[PDB]
Structures are given as C-alpha cells and as structure tokens.
Design a protein around this ligand. Sequence first.
Ligand SMILES: O=C(Nc1ccc([N+](=O)[O-])cc1)C1CC1
Ligand SMILES: O=C(Nc1ccc([N+](=O)[O-])cc1)C1CC1
Lengths: 469, 469
Amino acid sequence: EFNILLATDSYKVTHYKQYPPNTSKVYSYFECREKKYEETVFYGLQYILNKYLKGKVVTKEKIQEAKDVYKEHFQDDVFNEKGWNYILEKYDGHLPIEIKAVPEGFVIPRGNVLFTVENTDPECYWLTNWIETILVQSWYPITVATNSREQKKILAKYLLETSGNLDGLEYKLHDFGYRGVSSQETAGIGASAHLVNFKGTDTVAGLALIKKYYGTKDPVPGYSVPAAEHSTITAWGKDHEKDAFEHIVTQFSSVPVSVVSDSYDIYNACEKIWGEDLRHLIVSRSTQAPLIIRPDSGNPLDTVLKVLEILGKKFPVTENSKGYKLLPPYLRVIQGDGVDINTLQEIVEGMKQKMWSIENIAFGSGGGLLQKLTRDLLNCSFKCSYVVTNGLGINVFKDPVADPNKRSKKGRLSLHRTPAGNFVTLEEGKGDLEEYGQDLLHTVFKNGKVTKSYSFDEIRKNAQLNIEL
Amino acid sequence: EFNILLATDSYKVTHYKQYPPNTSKVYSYFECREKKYEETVFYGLQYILNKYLKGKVVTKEKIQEAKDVYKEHFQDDVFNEKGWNYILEKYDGHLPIEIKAVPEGFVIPRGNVLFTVENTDPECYWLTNWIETILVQSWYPITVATNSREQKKILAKYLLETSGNLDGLEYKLHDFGYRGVSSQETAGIGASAHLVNFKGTDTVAGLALIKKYYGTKDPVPGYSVPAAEHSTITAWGKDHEKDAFEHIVTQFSSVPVSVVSDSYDIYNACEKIWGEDLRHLIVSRSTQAPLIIRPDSGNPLDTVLKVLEILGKKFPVTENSKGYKLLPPYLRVIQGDGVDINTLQEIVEGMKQKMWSIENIAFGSGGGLLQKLTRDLLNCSFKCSYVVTNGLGINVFKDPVADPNKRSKKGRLSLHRTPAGNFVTLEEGKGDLEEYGQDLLHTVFKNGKVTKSYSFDEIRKNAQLNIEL
Ligand SMILES: O=C(Nc1ccc([N+](=O)[O-])cc1)C1CC1
Ligand SMILES: O=C(Nc1ccc([N+](=O)[O-])cc1)C1CC1
C-alpha cells in the first residue's frame, strides 16, 4: 500500500527543523517558468489528488514504517513523528492542505501560476513542501498534453492548407508508446494526456485511468484498428511476405487495417506486392475500411515521399480542390517510426512541397510522444512565495545572481483575465485589490477532500485549438 | 487491480488472427541492438516477472472486463476470449510461457541475447508476443543502470587519478530525480537501477522496491543526509540568509549537512557568509559531519570552479599525495544542477585541469539520471526469431533494406563464453552443436513460476567496475 510519508525526497524529511521558528504558514505555487511551447495545457492534477492525496492517508502503521525506514536511511533519528501524529489525531489522517488550481484543460501562457498549495493548520507549516515531490510530477501529464497539442497545431495547419478542412484531424497522431515508457503507471498517465488532443491510442492503460479519475460520456476516450507487427509478417517466412499480406487484409476485409510493409524491402512491397500482386484486394476495399500501408524504417521524410511516389504510380490519384494529390480512399499511409514534433513538421512540409495532401498520411509516435520529455522542457517548477512568521506575512522568493530565468514570484498569487482577454499572474497579494476580475484559480482540494472535479469531456473542450474554434 | 489482458498494445489483440495457420510455437528474444554505451547492465526483469507475470494472472472477471473494453475500443469484437479462457481453465490462469535470461547485474556487450520468451503450450502461440509490451519496459531499468554505471566509470577514473584511491566513490552521484520522473512507479524502478551502482538516493520509492523484489543483507540499499532546499533558506527573508544558514548548520551540527547556497548570490554566500561571518561554525565541525556547500545555478563547470577558488582562499587547503588541492575535511561541495553524463565529464576534467582533487566534489542528478533516457539509447528491442508451423521450425527475422541496423537475429538463440572469455550469441540453434560450451542464459520463469532469482547484493557484485575488481 502507498505511504505518503515515504513519497517525498529524502531531504524534505529534515525540513521541519530548518524553517524559521514561529512559522505558521508556508505557501507555494507551481508554474511552467518562462524562458516554442509558449502556452501549456494544465492537466493531471486531479489524478494525483484522487490517487495519492485524498482521504485518510496517515495511519499509525504508516508512521511507524516511515520511522523505521528513515532511521536506517539517514543513520540518524531525524523524522517529524510528532507532526505526523498530529495529523492522524486531529484530522483523522487527512491532510490539512488547501490547493487552488486553474481548470484542467485550460491553455495558459508560460510564466503563470497554475496551482497553489498552503497549510490550513499552523502546526502543519512543514506539510506544504512535503508534498512538492508528488505534486511536481504533474509536469509529466502537462508536458505530454502540451507537446501533443503542439503537434495537433502543426497537423491542423497543413491539413487545412492542403485539403481545405480538418476532417479526421483527431485521428492523425496515434499513441504507439506503451513499450517505450518507463513503467505501467507512466503509460496510463501519458496515454491519458495524449487523449486530451486526439482519439487514437494503442496504450490501453490510458482508457482505465480516464474512466476512473475523469470520466467521459462515451464508453471509451480512445480507439484503434487491426494492425500487423513484424512478428505476424516475418513468421510466414522470408519467401512468403505476399502470403502474410494476403491473409491479413483478407482477415480484416471490412475494417481499416494497418500493415507494416518494411520487413525486407518497403519499396518492393509497395510497388510489386501491394501495387501489382495484391492490387485486386486493395482496390475492392471500402472507404470506411482502407488498407493503411506502414513503412517503419529509413529516413522518415525520404521514405514517406518515396512510398507516396510509388503508390501514386500504381494506384489512381486525384487532385483535390487545393491542387494537392490524393490517393484513392481505400489506400492510406502511416509513418510510425522516429516521429516527434520536429520530424512531424519536416514530413508535412516535405509532403506539401511535393504537392501531396496531408489527407494521405497519418502518424504514430511512441518514445517521441510519451518518453522523450523532461521537466526542464516547460520548466515545471514549485516554489515557496509566501510565509507567515510571528504573525507577519512576508513575500519570499529566490533570485540567483547567475540565472535570472530561475527567479521566482513573490507573495500571494492569483490568476486573472486581462482587459484584452489574456492571462496575468498578480503577485504580492495584489489580487485582493480587485482591479482585475475574479481569480481563475479554484479550490480543488481542502483538508483531505477533493472539492472540485472535471470530466474528461470538459478538459477536451478547454484544450481545443483556436483553429478548431 | 492490474489486468494483463489490458496491458498490451491494442493491435496485439488482433495478432492471433494473423500468424500462419497451424502455428504451434512463437519464440522471441530481447537485445540491446548494436549500432558510447558499448555494454549494458541487465537489470529489472525480476521486478516485472514478480509484479505482473507470475501466478494466477487470469480470472473470469478480468476476461470479461477486457472483452467489454475491446468491444468499444475497436468498435468490433476481435478479442481472443477463447484463448484466454483456455489458459484460465487449463492452467488456473498461470501463463504457459518459458523465459530464459542472463543473470541480473551482468554487464554484456551490445547485440547479445539478454532474454528469450516462448510458449510452452501450442494453443498459446499468440501469448509470446502479447507480453512483448510489458517485457520491453525492462529497457528502462536497463538503461538507467547502464547510464548510471557509465557515470561511475568517469568518476572512478578521475577520483583515482586525482586522489590515488576510490574512497567514497559509491556516494559521488546522488539520485535527485524523484520530482522529475513521470510517475511514482517509474521513480521506484529508476531509483533501484541507480542503486545498482551507487548508495546515495533521495528517491525513497527505490528502497521498498528493492526490499520487496530483490533484497539486501543490509537494512536499506541507499542513504541520504540532511539538506536544505530553497524554501528553507528563502523563508527567512532576503536579508536573513545568514540566519538561515546558522540555524540549519547548528540544528545539524553532528551529521553531514548540505546547504543550497545560490538563492540570491552564490559567490557572496561562499566568500562572505560561509567564508567570513559563519566560518567559526564550519571549521569546528567533524570530519564525519562536513558542511556540504551546494551551488544550484549558472554554468555548472564555471560555477564549480569559482566556488572552489573562493573556498580555497577562505579555508585552509592542503595538497594531497597526487599534487591536487584538497579542501579541509569539514568542507565539501556538491553540484546538483544540470548534471548528466556529458556535463559530469566536463566538470571533473575541468577540476583536474585546475588542480582540484575529485575528493572535493560530489554530484546530484535528477532529470538527467532518471528521465532523460529513451528506449532508443541502447536500442532495446524484442523480436520473433523462430516459429513452428505445421510441425516444422523456421528461422525468422526482419531485415529492412534502408536500415541494416534494424536487422534482427535468426532462429533459436543462446549465449556463450568465447575462448577468450567474452560473450557470443549463437543463432539458428547452433548452440546445440556444442562447440561453444553451455548456454549462459538460465530459465527464470516457467508456467507461472519464477524459477531463478537474484538478490540485490548479487546484482551489485555482477555490476562492479573492472577498476573496482
Ligand atoms: O499501429 C498500431 N499499433 C502500433 C504500431 C507500432 C507500435 N510500435 O511500438 O512500434 C506500437 C503500436 C495500430 C494503430 C494501428
Ligand atoms: O540534496 C539532497 N536532496 C535533494 C536536493 C535537490 C533535489 N532537487 O530535485 O533539486 C532533490 C533532492 C540530499 C542529499 C542531501
């Protein structure tokens, strides 16, 4: 069973001894610190609140277990047993903490307060930053949602330019990252964040997370279709690739089907196998059940373009109203190797240059989508900005001489709409002057209870692109 | 509760329909594919086997849930209910799978077989690659362990060169990554992998993982010391940084204590606060309880060197037997910002150039240690190499025309010692010719049981540096 007393950075165990004496309040905030990725999607806090922070999270057994571990870990007795005892006795083990946050799904420019944390009982001044470690891991669903949305923007721009609309946009980037992330839990969280922006996923863990913690009106938030892997092609033997292809498209003759085509020679597979030997099984397929040819190696741009050129000469191509070339509806292509935000951009720009509509292609992304991201990317960061000592509130901050980018905000914070409709974070408790509208942060957690929740449907709505609006 | 029927990539749900008819065996293998990082530490499979794969992993309820989810996910009924029911009924839900693996902790050159997987019941031919996704997540602990060991190699070389010994090596790279990883589960796995090589960690989650799945003779596998963070310094107020320092080092006067010193002006803190105002509290400390000064911003190399030059002029410096400068034993430095394998190398080399012993410094690493890694780094990969169809075994492989680096191995594999004492992987069942002695892989999982296991102490022993040996 999870033990919040063992879910912090070791050194925080010692911090209760280091704050100024007579400190009754410690107030901290999270931002994606300023100084590409100019705005971030706030998503994932609700998962953390519900899974780890709510309810009776302190018990006698958990305190003793923590005491036992820390004794050995530090080779010394430092550990605030009395402080944790207090929470257990006075609050039945519920955390005397208040968290206020911008609504999930909201898209906020860098350098704004996204949530704040403070103790609600003076005895628990040390608790605010105890939970920094667990709360800061919200960086991951924020960053996955944000990077996924930025890719959607690229896809939308090029799809609109080359086709004149956005049909199918929400299926143009599929999550292939299940095997490529660091754990089962990470897979579920990351997959859920991608689904804020798209509907295609193979990372099944995401579905159950959304249902349990957020919820959708639809049965599931994400979808997939039958597809081959190299094992299901290569198992037929090197000389029987055609047989494998035929068996697979025939098994799935009435649904869309993706077939990896690069086991031996992608260009041969497209020109001679699909384009000649098995052409009769492709041209007969429904518009709702195309063959999706999947290259999986080589330079992503070069391979995509060469695959399109080969297919364009074996299959009947039209030119759409924008002047771009379009494969017949029963045939499409997906590139799912080496795709990240950089290579996605290069591929669609290259296609546009060669007069191929983005209607022709879809993408899959694995490591690039769910693993190749860090907390540094959006500078997701949690800092103390206000304390009360001897009954006096003081505005606190860091401001390292050698790195102005690491300066933190001062005092009590609030998030507001500007007169032009943008966002501003007010410092030093200036929000109390009420010269702006209402504070956009809402209490989402107080004293062990989740106080405000969002469905996944609401989150999707909040994270919509402008071009969709 | 975890459901293995829901812990695979979506498309694999459809693979049982795609293999050649009458396939009785699918045999697959995992390697860190060839073409820095010339050898990898094999670590983490044992966690996966015990947490996810062993015992009764299939129930009537789990089957029904998966069926209901996939119906919606695919908008069709393609889920192999009968296949999963067979396992439930025939094997009381235990997986008829045999896995053979190299010993955990082993250090093996790239491009060798590390583990193999095959079904033990011909009806379960589809099961081998169903569990690809979960087994391939072993990439993460392998890669963290490997990259952590590569950093140890660097620290060893320079510590040995500048000091004449390796005293304290195992505490020279501390895990600061808890907040910077993508999940709680990832934190535990990654921290455990770092502890294969070092003994310093703040990622508490790693301790319980090791205790449950591996075990040590010692009470805990990793340790920490009291340390400040920006909040426990800045909470005192901008004008009271000296007061914060004095309070903290007085509270922790008889144990080592690390104090972040860059909240406002690192160079001032070193020269004026530590070096003058509070000097009397530092020079009085025990060799067993040094002050560890922690810069945390600026160019890592430039800041480390300037911090050392400052301290060297305020405190009594000696010259060790190797001719390098050494701070007094009550004073040390730790760099814990922007440390990864590249910058670690730059710092120790720059210190050597400026005649500072590596005895003076330790490192902390967070994102660089536990998060900024992908499956692509060591090319961790799982592929089918052998199948039996209509009673005939065939050697199978991929070999993409555009990327020779993605060619996979053929047929039944085994791992052997060469006449010179190195590793070789034999393909095509050639291990059976018995010209290369015994297979070095061991059966670690068979039919729902873990059949061979390693303590964390054994793993540490296997992973030692040659220089330590
Ligand atoms: O293509 C699909 N899934 C999939 C493909 C490749 C990987 N991978 O890891 O390379 C993982 C999953 C289905 C949407 C059609
Ligand atoms: O320095 C320590 N812990 C620690 C410091 C900084 C971070 N961080 O994330 O920045 C995390 C943990 C203790 C070993 C003394």
